[PDB]
């Protein structure tokens, strides 16, 4: 067989619809993501990647921190998350603000502000939600 | 249609020509024209390790026990017999093995030539001192028993080998 | 449909030879495999893509049925003698059992060289049967060593040939059973 | 074969497995089965009136005279010829439908019975029901016979 | 090993004339070639041996071990050099090796290797260069580990 | 349907009870992700079971490297618990799968919308699998059932 073809039978475009690039086993994966699922306001999409990233950011920090070893650990752990959280999201801002300059797709000034403001919210209460988490276990 | 073995047939390439030819070939190994051996080089070799072998039956036998040449002392079968004759006369011995070594360089040389043309046939070095050649009857006789012969000392010298060397 | 008669007489089984009453119920004869590349491998250089019209499976199993017969009844007859004492001359084959006998002369060398002449005589049998499919009339067991000459009356030889082959499976079977039973327990 | 009849059972195949095809090898399966079964009755009954003349065959119930012959030998003779025969008997394996042989036939009619078509069909009528008790019978006969001390009756 | 001076050690040319001052070493010659044809190659374990480790006294590498090693790999060698076709039927085709090996994801497999490799030096030339590189670093980690020489 | 793959073998079409014989296209459907699901997690199974027997324990669990059923006590219950989970994800991830319109049973990788055309290699290497899924399945019901009944525990004469 030839499980290689080229990329929306397009042999000219830079691309291959490999097993790894069109199967449906990543297609299904992507598409339910909340970067790119269907019927997911820019707000919901954002909260959904801030809650996934802070709750996962906590524990490096907890665990590697210069303060690891001391009783406190996990309270640094948490503000450094939270600092890189913020930074993360000064980052986004300013993205938003050069890229989409001349509610929607993603892909424009109100869209990216919301998703923006949804990553923030969502980011606190993963770290927070990782920190209750801890606390006690 | 071989007269040796009448289930399988003849070669096509043994006529009958060569002496002591009963068209005893299974495997056809006269057939080759690979590798350069092509049944000249197979005759040669078989007058060659025929001759060898009944100098070798005759050496073995040792009846007068004088080693040969004077003043080569004591009997023994073969390895032993074969040490003590180079301890004694190392001179001699390596003698012999270098008139050998002269007679199988021409010899190879020979082959080559004969190879290449028909003038030098196998097993022939114009040794003959009777220098008959002219009438063929007898020189097939004199050829084919001289391989028949031989063909015996090889058997021969192969029971000489076989004692003491098994378990 | 013969010597098993709930079963189609094999197809490729021809009740044509010697000995046949159709027996082949595990289809043995059925393999399409020529049996000729087993000697002379493959393309090989002595061979030219021939058709596999005289090899082929019934061929090669019926050399194989002659040659077991015959060596068994061989074996048996003289396993038989040896055991009523038959020792010969020499010295070293006395005082050795039968069961004894084959490792014995193992380690004697006599047996060493007994297989050199087997191995000459088995090497004349495969250029045989390599003939045969070079385009030979060769029979399977056929050695052309025959004293009797009876193939020319054309009907007493297939008498012969039948009864060779019965007795000689007899002679198998009854050899295989005198060994495990000899083996099992000491009789004449 | 079967036929249809008696009361319980006339056309008994609830399940319907003969609808999926390929009878034939259900019906050689069944008369193998029914074979074995009525032998095995028989050779339930009998070692209790009667026992082998060999000292090893002497003693020791049915239900322990599997293995005390499994481990004398003759539980492993009887397999190495049953073997026998069920490796010559290839026929049946690949070829139910293509084969014109009827199932569960061999060429062994001394009778002659089978020679008249209708006391034929009466004969493997009669050894398809009476091997169908037997298996039956023998299947209760074992049960029984573990259940209760003694096998003789049971 | 043993402590004779080099004086005293006859010369190698000792070592193949008479048997017995070599028995005197590895008491298995005695019984001579005999025992590799007859298959009993066991009786060869004296200087034969699969020891490995290191020699005590010299620090390097057993020498009966080099010797089995190189044995083995004599013989490996030759059955491997019987693997391709060349004259007589009997071989391998190297093209039709390559054009048989293709699966789905590489489409036509190695179909045209052969004719580079037997069209052009320098493709032969760069596989050649990279054995021989990768060969030559694996060589320079195995003798420190295993020192071969004494 | 016997143009599903799985059907090159001896038996050829094995359905001696009627399960295949007149079910919608729905419940063959059903019945050959439950083949491949039983029969991939069985391949798992006796490749773990091999592991367990031979030794091979990861270093957070030392103590037990010796019969997989006794192993299986030292998991803590939250370890069972987290595989539960990823088992969970992933069949939500399959469930997933289910719902776009090309869907074969079991083409999770979606066979149809990548290979150029059709095959028969493709069919018979799915066969391969099937296969190799089918022994798996009897030899690890086998290996749970031989370890239960005799305690010994395979590698030690069962
Ligand atoms: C074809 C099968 C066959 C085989 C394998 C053997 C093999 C053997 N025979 Mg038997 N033998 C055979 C056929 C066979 N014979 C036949 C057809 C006869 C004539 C009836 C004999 C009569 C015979 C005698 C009388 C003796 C042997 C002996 C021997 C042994 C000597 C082997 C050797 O080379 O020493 C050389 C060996 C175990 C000798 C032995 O040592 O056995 C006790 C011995 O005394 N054999
Ligand atoms: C009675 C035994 C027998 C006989 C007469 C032959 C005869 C032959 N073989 Mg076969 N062969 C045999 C047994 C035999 N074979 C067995 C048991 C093996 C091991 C499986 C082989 C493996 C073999 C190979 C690999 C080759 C031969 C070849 C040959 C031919 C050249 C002679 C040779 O090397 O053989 C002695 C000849 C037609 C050669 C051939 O066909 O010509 C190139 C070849 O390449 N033979
Ligand atoms: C019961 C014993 C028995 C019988 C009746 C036969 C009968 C026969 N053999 Mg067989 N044979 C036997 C034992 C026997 N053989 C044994 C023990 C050997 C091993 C030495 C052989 C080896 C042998 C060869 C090698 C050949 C025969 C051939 C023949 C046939 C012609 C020769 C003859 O005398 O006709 C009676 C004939 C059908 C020849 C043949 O097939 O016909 C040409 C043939 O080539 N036989
Ligand atoms: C060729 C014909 C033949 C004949 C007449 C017999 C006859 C007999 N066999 Mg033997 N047997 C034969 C072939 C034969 N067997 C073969 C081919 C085998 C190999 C499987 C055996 C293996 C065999 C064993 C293992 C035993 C017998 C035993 C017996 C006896 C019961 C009886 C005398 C038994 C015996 O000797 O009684 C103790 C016994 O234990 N036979
Ligand atoms: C299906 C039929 C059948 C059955 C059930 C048996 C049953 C038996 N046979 Mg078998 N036998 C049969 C047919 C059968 N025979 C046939 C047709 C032959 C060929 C003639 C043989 C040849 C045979 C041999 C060679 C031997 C047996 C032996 C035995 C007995 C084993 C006793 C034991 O362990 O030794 C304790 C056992 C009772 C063995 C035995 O000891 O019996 C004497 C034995 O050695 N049988
Ligand atoms: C190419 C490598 C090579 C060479 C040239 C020799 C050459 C020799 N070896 Mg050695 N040998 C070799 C490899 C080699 N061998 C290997 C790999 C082993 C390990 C199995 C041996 C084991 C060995 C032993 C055990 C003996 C010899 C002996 C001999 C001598 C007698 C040869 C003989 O009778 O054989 C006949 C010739 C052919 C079969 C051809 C001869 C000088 C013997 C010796 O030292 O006596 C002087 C002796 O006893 N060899
Ligand atoms: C079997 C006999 C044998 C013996 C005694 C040795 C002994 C030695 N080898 Mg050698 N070696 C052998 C066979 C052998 N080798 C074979 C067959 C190969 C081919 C892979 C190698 C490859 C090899 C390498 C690459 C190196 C050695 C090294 C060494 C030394 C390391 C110390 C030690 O204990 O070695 C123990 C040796 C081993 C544990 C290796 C065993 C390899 C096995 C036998 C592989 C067998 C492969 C199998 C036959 C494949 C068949 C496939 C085919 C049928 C298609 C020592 C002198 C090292 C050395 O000398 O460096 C200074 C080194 O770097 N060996
Ligand atoms: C049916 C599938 C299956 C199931 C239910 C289990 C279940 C279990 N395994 Mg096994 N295992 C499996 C497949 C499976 N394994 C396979 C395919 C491998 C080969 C990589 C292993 C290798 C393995 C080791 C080495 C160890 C276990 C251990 C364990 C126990 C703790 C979980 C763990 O450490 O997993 C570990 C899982 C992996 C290392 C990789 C899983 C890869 C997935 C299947 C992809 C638990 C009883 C441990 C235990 O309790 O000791 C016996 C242990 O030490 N398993
Ligand atoms: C030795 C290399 C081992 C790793 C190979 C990975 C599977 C490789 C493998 O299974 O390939 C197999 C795959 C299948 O090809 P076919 O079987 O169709 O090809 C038939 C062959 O005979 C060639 O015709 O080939 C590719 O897809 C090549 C591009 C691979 C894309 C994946 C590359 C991943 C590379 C990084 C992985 C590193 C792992 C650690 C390395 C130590
Ligand atoms: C399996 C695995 C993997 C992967 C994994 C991953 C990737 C994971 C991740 C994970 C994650 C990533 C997780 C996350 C989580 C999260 C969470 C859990 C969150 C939560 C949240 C919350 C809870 C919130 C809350 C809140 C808010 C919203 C705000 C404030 C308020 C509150 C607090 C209410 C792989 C296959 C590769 C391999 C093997 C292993």
Same mark, same amino acid.
């Given at each position: ?73 996990? *309270?640094?752990?948490? *503000? ?39 990553? *923030? ?17 | ?167 | ?10 197809? #490729?089984? /021809? ?16 393999? /399409? ?49 040896? /055991? ?42 495969? #250029? #045989?049967?390599?003939? #045969? ?8 067991? /056929? ?46 | ?154 | ?150 | ?39 991939? @997690? ?84 799915? @066969? ?18 031989? @370890? ?11």
């Amino acid at each position: 067989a030839n499980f290689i073809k080229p990329y929306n039978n397009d042999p000219f475009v830079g691309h291959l619809s490999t097993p790894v690039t069109t199967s449906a086993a990543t297609k299904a994966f992507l598409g339910n993501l909340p970067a790119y699922r269907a019927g997911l306001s820019p707000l919901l999409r954002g909260l959904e990647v801030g809650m996934a990233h802070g709750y996962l950011l906590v524990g490096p920090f907890d665990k590697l921190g210069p303060l690891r070893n001391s009783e406190i650990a996990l *309270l640094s752990g948490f *503000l450094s998350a939270v600092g890189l959280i913020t930074i993360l999201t000064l980052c986004l801002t300013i993205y938003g603000k050069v890229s989409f300059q001349e509610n929607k797709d993603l892909l424009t000034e109100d869209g990216w502000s919301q998703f923006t403001s949804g990553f *923030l919210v969502g980011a606190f209460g993963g770290a927070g939600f990782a920190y209750l988490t801890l606390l006690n276990l | 249609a071989s007269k040796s073995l009448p289930f399988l047939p003849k070669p096509e390439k043994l006529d009958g020509s060569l002496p002591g030819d009963v068209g005893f070939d299974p495997l056809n190994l006269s057939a080759t024209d690979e590798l350069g051996l092509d049944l000249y080089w197979f005759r040669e070799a078989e007058v060659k390790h025929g001759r060898i072998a009944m100098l070798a039956v005759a050496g073995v036998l040792f009846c007068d026990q004088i080693g040969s040449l004077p003043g080569f002392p004591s009997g023994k079968d073969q390895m032993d017999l074969f040490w003590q004759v180079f301890a004694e006369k190392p001179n001699v011995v390596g003698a012999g093995v270098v008139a050998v070594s002269i007679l199988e360089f021409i010899s190879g040389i020979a082959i080559t030539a004969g190879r290449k043309d028909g003038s030098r046939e196998a097993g022939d070095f114009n040794l003959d001192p009777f220098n008959v050649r002219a009438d063929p009857a007898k020189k097939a006789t004199a050829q084919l028993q001289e391989i028949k012969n031989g063909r015996l000392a090889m058997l021969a010298s192969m029971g000489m080998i076989a004692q003491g060397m098994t378990t | 449909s013969k010597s098993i008669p709930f079963a189609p007489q094999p197809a #490729a089984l /021809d009740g044509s030879l010697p000995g046949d009453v159709g027996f082949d119920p595990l289809g043995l004869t059925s393999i /399409d495999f020529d049996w000729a590349k087993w000697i002379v491998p493959a393309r090989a250089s002595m061979r030219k893509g021939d058709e596999p019209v005289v090899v082929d499976t019934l061929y090669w199993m019926r050399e194989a049925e002659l040659k077991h017969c015959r060596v068994a009844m061989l074996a048996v007859v003289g396993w038989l003698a040896v /055991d009523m004492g038959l020792r010969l001359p020499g010295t070293k084959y006395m005082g050795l059992s039968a069961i004894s006998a084959h490792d014995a002369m193992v380690s004697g060398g006599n047996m060493v060289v007994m297989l050199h002449f087997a191995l000459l005589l088995e090497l004349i049998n495969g #250029a #045989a049967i390599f003939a #045969a499919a070079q385009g030979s009339g060769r029979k399977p067991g /056929d050695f052309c060593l025959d004293p009797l000459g009876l193939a020319k009356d054309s009907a007493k030889s297939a008498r012969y040939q039948l009864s060779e082959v019965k007795n000689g499976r007899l002679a198998m079977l009854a050899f295989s059973g005198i060994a495990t039973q000899a083996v099992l327990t000491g009789h004449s | 074969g079967a036929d249809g009849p008696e009361p319980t059972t006339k056309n008994f195949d609830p399940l319907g497995l003969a609808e999926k095809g390929d009878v034939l090898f259900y019906r050689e399966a069944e008369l193998k089965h029914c074979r074995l079964a009525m032998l095995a009755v028989v050779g339930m009954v009998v070692p209790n009136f009667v026992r082998l003349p060999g000292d090893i065959y002497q003693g020791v119930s049915v239900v322990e005279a599997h293995n005390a012959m499994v481990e004398k030998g003759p539980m492993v003779q009887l397999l190495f010829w049953l073997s026998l025969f069920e490796i010559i008997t290839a026929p049946l394996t690949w070829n139910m439908q293509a084969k014109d042989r009827e199932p569960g036939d061999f060429s062994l009619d001394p009778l002659g019975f089978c020679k008249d078509p209708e006391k034929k069909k009466r004969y493997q009528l009669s050894e398809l029901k009476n091997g169908r008790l037997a298996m039956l019978a023998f299947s209760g006969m074992i049960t029984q016979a573990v259940l209760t001390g003694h096998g003789f009756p049971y | 090993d043993a402590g004779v001076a080099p004086q005293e050690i006859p010369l190698p040319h000792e070592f193949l004339v008479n048997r017995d001052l070599i028995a005197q070493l590895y008491p298995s010659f005695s019984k001579g070639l005999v025992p590799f044809f007859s298959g009993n190659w066991s009786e060869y374990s004296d200087f034969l041996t699969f020891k490995g480790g290191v020699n005590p006294v010299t620090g390097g590498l057993w020498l009966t071990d080099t010797a089995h090693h190189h044995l083995a790999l004599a013989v490996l060698f030759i059955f491997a050099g019987h693997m391709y076709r060349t004259n007589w039927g009997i071989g391998h085709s190297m093209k039709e090796m390559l054009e048989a090996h293709k699966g789905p994801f590489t489409g036509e497999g190695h179909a045209g290797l052969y004719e580079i490799l037997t069209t052009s030096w320098h493709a032969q030339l760069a596989i050649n260069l990279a054995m021989i590189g990768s060969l030559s670093i694996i060589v320079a980690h195995h003798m420190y580990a295993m020192p071969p020489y004494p | 349907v016997k143009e599903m793959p799985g059907v090159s073998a001896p038996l050829g079409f094995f359905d001696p009870l009627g399960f295949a014989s007149k079910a919608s296209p729905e419940t063959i459907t059903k019945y050959r992700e439950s083949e491949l699901r039983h029969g991939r @997690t069985a391949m798992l199974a006796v490749l773990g079971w091999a592991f367990t027997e031979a030794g091979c324990h990861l270093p957070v669990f030392p103590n037990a490297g010796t019969n997989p059923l006794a192993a299986a006590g030292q998991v803590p219950f939250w370890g069972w618990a987290q595989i539960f989970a990823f088992c969970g994800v992933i069949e939500f991830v399959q469930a997933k799968i289910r719902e776009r319109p090309g869907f074969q049973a079991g083409d999770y990788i979606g066979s149809g919308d990548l290979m150029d055309e059709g095959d028969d290699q493709w069919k018979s290497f799915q @066969t391969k699998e099937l296969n190799n899924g089918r022994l798996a399945m009897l030899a690890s019901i086998g290996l749970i059932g031989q @370890t239960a009944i005799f305690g010994q525990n395979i590698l030690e004469q069962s």
